Every structure is written in C-alpha cells, then in structure tokens.
Amino acid sequence: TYKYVNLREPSMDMKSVTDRAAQTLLWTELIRGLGMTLSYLFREPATINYPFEKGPLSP
Amino acid sequence: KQDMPPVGGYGPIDYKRNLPRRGLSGYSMFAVGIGALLFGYWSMMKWNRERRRLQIEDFEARIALMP
C-alpha cells in the first residue's frame, strides 16, 4: 500500500510562528536536541580487553 | 521433534515514532529572556554609577595636593 512522509504544510497562523521563531533565533532545538542526547556518556563502555579477555564464538 | 517456535510469549515492539515533549515554548520564551536581561541593566546603574562616585574621590586626592 502507501505511506506519505514529509507531506504536510505548516500551520501558518499567529500562534505557531512564534513557536518556530523561538526555534531559529533562540535555539530550542540543537541544545535540547544534541546537548543532551550525546551526554548520555554515563553508560558503561563495552570494550573487550583483548590480550586477556576474548570474545564469544560458536561451535 | 526438537524445533523452535514457542507456544506463547510475545510483545511485540512498536514501529512508532514519538518524542514531542514541550518544552516551555510560545511566549513563555522571549519572556524569561527579557526578564533576565532587564535584571542585568538594573544591576548596572547601581555599580557603574557608584564607581563614578569613587572615581571623583580618586581625582580628589590629586587636587588637594600639588601646590
């Protein structure tokens, strides 16, 4: 069948333009976007310590 | 007779797409900004004006000497 992606017009009224003009000018994206998704460094790293530890295999 | 598929125990996981959390938008911003900025200039005129008073005292000690 179908699915349409990126087929939508903007709202283009008085309210939601300030919602978009807060984005371009004062960066409500790009900090909430990727100043938080990256850090998120607080997970445990997964490194096989190779001369001693070795990885899984199969028979 | 030892074959895979279970009789039950399933999810599934979604195919969906959603994380639109707002977010303090739409006249809430541009209002905390101006309200912060006007606190800055109000914190000026109490220091820059006051330093201008001590400035004249610094010139004052010069003028009371040098005859």
- The residue among A41, A45, A29, A36 whose CA lies nearest residue B25 is A29
A44-54 in b/e form (b: 16+ CB < 10 A) is eeeeeeeeeee
For this experimental structure, what is the resolution in angstroms?
A: 3.8
Q: Which of A15, A16, A22 lies at the smallest CB-CB distance from B29?
A: A22
Structural element, H or E, at residue A27 = none
Beta-carbon separation of A26 and B33 below 8 A: yes
Q: Cα-flanking dihedrals φ and ψ of residue B42, to 5°? A: -70, -25
For residue A23, how far is the Cα from the chain centroid? 16
What was the elucidation method?
cryo-EM
CA dihedral B29, B33, B36, B38 (to 10 degrees): -130
How many C-beta atoms surround the C-beta of residue A15 within 10 A?
A: 9
Beta-carbon separation of B30 and A15 below 8 A: no
